[PDB]
Design a binder for this molecule. Structure first.
Ligand SMILES: *P(=O)(O)OCC(C)(C)[C@@H](O)C(=O)NCCC(=O)NCCS
Ligand SMILES: [Mg+2]
Lengths: 97, 217, 87, 133, 115, 68
């Protein structure tokens, strides 16, 4: 947050911070972050956080087989909480560099 | 022995003569068109005359999901997913329109109704339109499929988790939570297992139907 | 009926059918120019030309050899197999 | 009443005398539960199409069997496409414009194998039923 | 039965029907004396900021015995003329559509599967 | 294509059927088969050539529908 955040995309820093955490500490990150298993997929972690927060909602899609209820969370909402998760000490002390 | 569900009548104040009349009519039709022994799990291909055309022949293949009705009006319903569309047709057994009924794959499932297959994953109801009949030796126990089926998200056509449905063929562990299970248990009705006047024994009734049937042939 | 299969007469009837075709005109058409390159005709175009030869002489052309026939001169030589012309 | 019957050979010849631009007559097998014979004919103008359709139906009634049900022309309000259904014959009157866009002959000759069915693909819901952007 | 404010599925190769959008198409109106619409009935649609007429082709509600019953509410987009906007119908349509009173022949013509 | 022979064979075989036509306008049938073999061809990838050939092959068979 020292420089303007407009330079980095909303979802852009997630993969870089995932790499940095995988470098130093992952088990504590997994325990604090609510992953079923350790992985390097940003989509999986974005899905894991949304369920934890509960901000997701059922949204109907109609198909020939039937009406199914997909959950379509606030991808923007998951994008920001990452910054407070890093800034707060819950994840553990990890130097990005 | 196997007696077709339709022949055994429901509890009623209907005079016995009415059933005798209907049985004779059914049995005549059975001579003309062979009705195969099928169960609720089984796979059937039904050939019918198409009235909306000039006597062209239609066949439809699918899995049986329920069998109901009594007398001539007795029915069954076949399900299948054709090229990405679920289709259900209810067929009358004694409709003259039907040409031929074949048992492609004769099997029972865990439970007597399969209406939950609508809420199950699409592939569990997807059956190949052109599949070869698979036949077993005549004096063999009717084989049971002990498949339990994975489900879609929890908004379902009916609340299957409730014990009134008594569904044994659903992977509940995968979809539901423990608290949901104990919530469903509030509708248990444990006395109903032991209600003695609630039961309907068809022993003597079926015996008399057998006597009629053996007389017919 | 036996028609006299003069080599010269064979040539005349072969060029007669080619001038009948829409794509190729007698201006650039010659006895020695080939269909595909010189006359600028596609492979599918060729198939129709051989059909013209098929019904005219009334002897079957197999699909195996129809491919190699890409020249009028090749044709007048091929149909010479039907009835041998020396001259 | 007795004499010529309603069939393709009579019906096509009947069309041809009103300057039917193109005629495609298609034999349909019994598995396709629609008709015995499918027919497509083109026309010059909108009023020319009405001329043909109305002649065919008029002549039909003349040679029609007593018990043979009456027929209804379809799409008189429509500009380019007219259709008439008979007992075992189905006819489509169109401009050349609508022939270029419908390709009815292609559909009925080759069913599941046509180009128009190939472009369109069935849409499937994701596993675990989660959408991602 | 498809009535007012019902979500429907456009089973066509038409651009308008298959286009990705934030709204599912909704039934504005049913062209019948009573509001309920069964198969073969015409209904008005609100799709993508416009009104369009459509033909009901199969529905979830049980019908007469031997008639098929689908798992989605399927409609075909049609012009007021009666000309279908799309060219092809992937999804099967019931054969019953044939004998019913009205302009059904064109839609039958562009359909591949009869059930 | 799958085979350069097979496509030229198919083009041949189809036109042979055209002679046997009875009701269908023979000029249109020929015109319709010609343009199909023109605009589709000269520009395709290897995999889709297996599909387009087959499309023609079922046209040849005429099992699902035969034009007369
Ligand atoms: P001819 O020498 O003009 O070419 C033969 C061909 C056009 C049939 C073909 O072999 C070709 O050169 N292009 C292949 C593309 C294609 O569509 N293949 C035929 C599949 S039906
Ligand atoms: Mg409900």
């Amino acid at each position: 947050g020292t420089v303007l955040d407009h330079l980095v995309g909303e979802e852009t820093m997630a993969d870089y911070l995932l790499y940095t955490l995988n470098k130093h500490q992952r088990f504590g990150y997994v325990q604090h972050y609510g992953l079923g298993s350790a992985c390097d997929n940003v989509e999986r972690v974005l899905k894991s956080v949304a369920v934890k927060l509960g901000k997701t909602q059922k949204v109907k899609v109609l198909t020939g087989t039937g009406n199914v209820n997909i959950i379509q969370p606030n991808y923007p909402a998951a994008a920001r909480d990452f910054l407070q998760t890093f800034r707060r000490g819950l994840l553990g002390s990890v130097m990005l560099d | 022995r196997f007696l077709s569900p339709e022949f055994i009548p429901r509890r009623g104040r209907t005079d016995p003569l009415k059933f005798q009349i209907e049985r004779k009519d059914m049995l005549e039709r059975r001579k003309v068109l062979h009705i195969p022994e099928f169960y609720v799990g089984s796979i059937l291909r039904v050939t019918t005359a198409d009235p909306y055309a000039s006597g062209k022949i239609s066949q439809f293949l699918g899995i049986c999901i329920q069998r109901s009705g009594r007398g001539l009006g007795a029915t069954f319903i076949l399900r299948n997913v054709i090229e990405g569309q679920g289709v259900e047709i209810c067929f009358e057994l004694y409709n003259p329109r039907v040409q031929e009924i074949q048992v492609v794959k004769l099997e029972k499932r865990l439970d007597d109704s399969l209406l939950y297959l609508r809420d199950a994953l699409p592939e569990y109801s997807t059956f190949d339109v052109n599949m070869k009949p698979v036949v077993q030796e005549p004096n063999q126990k009717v084989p049971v499929n002990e498949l339990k089926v994975k489900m879609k998200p929890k908004p379902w056509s009916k609340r299957w988790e409730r014990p009134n449905f008594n569904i044994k063929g659903i992977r509940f562990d995968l979809c539901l939570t423990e608290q949901q299970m104990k919530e469903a248990q509030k509708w248990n009705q444990p006395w109903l297992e032991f209600d003695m006047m609630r039961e309907y024994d068809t022993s003597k009734i079926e015996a008399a139907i057998w006597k009629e049937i053996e007389a017919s042939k | 009926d036996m028609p006299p299969l003069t080599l010269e007469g064979i040539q005349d009837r072969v060029l007669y059918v080619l001038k009948l075709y829409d794509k190729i005109d007698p201006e650039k058409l010659s006895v020695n120019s080939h269909f595909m390159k010189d006359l600028g005709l596609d492979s599918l175009d060729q198939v129709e030309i051989i059909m013209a030869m098929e019904d005219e002489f009334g002897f079957e052309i197999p699909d195996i050899d129809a491919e190699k026939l890409m020249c009028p001169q090749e044709i007048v030589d091929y149909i010479a197999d039907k009835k041998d012309v020396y001259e | 009443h007795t004499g010529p019957k309603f069939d393709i050979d009579m019906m096509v010849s009947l069309l041809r005398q009103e300057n039917a631009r193109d005629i495609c007559v298609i034999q349909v097998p019994p598995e396709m539960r629609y008709t015995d014979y499918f027919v497509i004919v083109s026309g010059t103008s909108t009023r020319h199409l009405h001329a043909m359709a109305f002649y065919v139906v008029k002549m039909y009634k003349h040679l029609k069997c007593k018990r043979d049900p009456h027929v209804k022309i379809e799409g008189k309000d429509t500009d380019d496409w007219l259709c008439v259904d008979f007992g075992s014959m189905v006819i489509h009157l169109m401009l050349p414009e609508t022939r270029e866009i419908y390709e009815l002959e292609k559909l009925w000759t080759l069913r599941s194998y046509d180009d128009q069915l190939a472009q369109i693909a069935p849409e499937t819901v994701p596993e675990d039923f989660i959408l991602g952007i | 039965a498809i009535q007012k404010m019902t979500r429907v599925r456009v089973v066509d190769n038409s651009a308008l029907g298959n286009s990705p959008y934030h709204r599912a198409p909704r039934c504005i109106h049913v062209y019948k004396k009573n509001g309920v619409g069964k198969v073969g009935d015409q209904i008005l649609l609100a799709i993508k900021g416009q009104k369009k007429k459509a033909l009901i082709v199969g529905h979830c509600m049980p019908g007469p015995r031997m008639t098929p019953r689908f798992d989605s509410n399927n409609v075909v987009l049609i012009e007021d003329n009666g000309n279908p906007v799309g060219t092809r119908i992937k999804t099967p349509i019931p054969t019953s559509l044939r004998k019913r009173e009205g302009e059904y022949s064109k839609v039958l013509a562009i359909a591949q599967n009869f059930v | 294509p799958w085979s350069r022979e097979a496509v030229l064979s198919l083009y041949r075989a189809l036109l042979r059927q055209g002679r046997q036509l009875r009701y269908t306008d023979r000029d249109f049938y020929f015109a319709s088969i010609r343009r199909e073999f023109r605009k589709n061809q000269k520009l395709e990838d290897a995999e889709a050539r297996e599909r387009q050939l087959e499309k023609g092959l079922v046209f040849l068979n005429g099992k699902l529908g035969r034009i007369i």
